[PDB]
Design a protein around this ligand. Structure first.
Ligand SMILES: NC1=NC(=O)c2ccccc21
Ligand SMILES: NC1=NC(=O)c2ccccc21
Length: 330
């Protein structure tokens, strides 16, 4: 089997991407944030604290003839931005782009933190990291991809995120029309539960490539590109007036600037992030200070190849027995 679904930016900045997902019988379609940095499929629901729901579409398990409460199971997750959610668990039928999994764990939110409530466009998360990170207790559950793997034509999914435009998640096949040149594959460590890999270096604009190993994760659920402080300083030094602002929480730059590109290495191959992809707009409405899309990971503990980086590429998440990642230009 295969599936193919369009993913759409939630706003004019590409702050996140939503993909429609069918849950239950008859189908209830919710717009979920596909997140290769986590491993829980959770949804706003009829069980979510009413004051914490503000415009989202909810899953109502009592209206699904295939929903079954997973007795005694609970979940609770917190994300790198400090947001969090928790609740109970159903199994139900879940379909993405024509690919169906029966008995998928659908984690129903009882509580969500303020940033989820305040974002009316995201109805939940669909985790695509390794199932070892799944938070369901006392019986850990498998991701949608893990459940689908046996049935897929090939044990892979691909992320093709757009810049200010829709893109595609495909399951079970590699669309050879969706990228240019060749896909360069690179090793993955699953030890932390992430799609963790090592970039071979970077360049700023037209500058020379610096060969240096940068360990990090491919994370579709993180908006920005978080890299070591040395790398980030080298980037922003090429933008007149750019500075790190402790009050804002990162590098800012004059909105009048034209930003340089940023290149990262995948083996001997190179992925170029155009400068425009690094502009996240005014720090507050009407400000002439703009927020940068490349930020320091120094306070995180891990480097993160988030959407800023991934949307410059066609990315293969190869879930074979020994997983690998593939990157191509597009
Ligand atoms: C709570 N945990 C449950 O298991 C449940 C079922 C129905 C409504 C609310 C809740
Ligand atoms: N992978 C993620 N990085 C985040 O900062 C985040 C927030 C909310 C959901 C998922 C994610």
């Amino acid at each position: 089997s295969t599936g193919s679904a369009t993913t759409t930016p939630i706003d004019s900045l590409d702050d996140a991407y939503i993909t429609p997902v069918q849950i239950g019988t008859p189908a209830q379609t919710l717009n979920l944030d596909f997140d290769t940095g986590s491993s829980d499929l959770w949804v706003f629901s009829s069980e979510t604290t009413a004051s914490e729901v503000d415009g989202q579409t909810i899953y109502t398990p009592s209206k699904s003839t295939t929903a079954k409460l997973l007795s005694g199971a609970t979940w609770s997750i917190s994300y790198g931005d400090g947001s969090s959610s928790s609740g109970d668990v159903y199994t139900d039928t879940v379909s993405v782009g024509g690919l169906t999994v029966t008995g998928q764990a659908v984690e129903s939110a009882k509580k969500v933190s303020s940033s989820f409530t305040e974002d009316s466009t995201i109805d939940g998360l669909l985790g695509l990291a390794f199932s070892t990170l799944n938070t369901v207790s006392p019986t850990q559950q498998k991701t949608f991809f893990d459940n689908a793997k046996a049935s897929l034509d090939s044990p892979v999914f691909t992320a093709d995120l757009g810049y200010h435009a829709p893109g595609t998640y495909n399951f079970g096949f590699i669309d050879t029309t969706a990228y240019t040149g060749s896909i360069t594959y690179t090793a993955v460590s699953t030890k932390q539960g992430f799609w963790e890999w090592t970039s071979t270096g970077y360049a700023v604009g037209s500058g020379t490539f610096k060969s240096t190993s940068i360990d990090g994760i491919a994370d579709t659920g993180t908006t920005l590109l978080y890299l070591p402080a040395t790398v980030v300083s080298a980037y922003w030094a090429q933008v007149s007036g750019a500075k790190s602002s402790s009050s804002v929480g990162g590098y800012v730059f004059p909105c009048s600037a034209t930003l340089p590109s940023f290149t990262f290495g995948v083996g001997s191959a190179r992925i170029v992030i155009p400068g425009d992809y690094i502009d996240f707009g005014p720090i507050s409405t009407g400000s002439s200070s703009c927020f940068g899309g490349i930020q320091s990971s120094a306070g995180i503990g891990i480097n993160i190849f988030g959407d800023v980086a991934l949307k410059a590429a066609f990315v293969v998440f190869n879930g074979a027995t020994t997983p690998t990642l593939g990157f191509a230009s597009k």
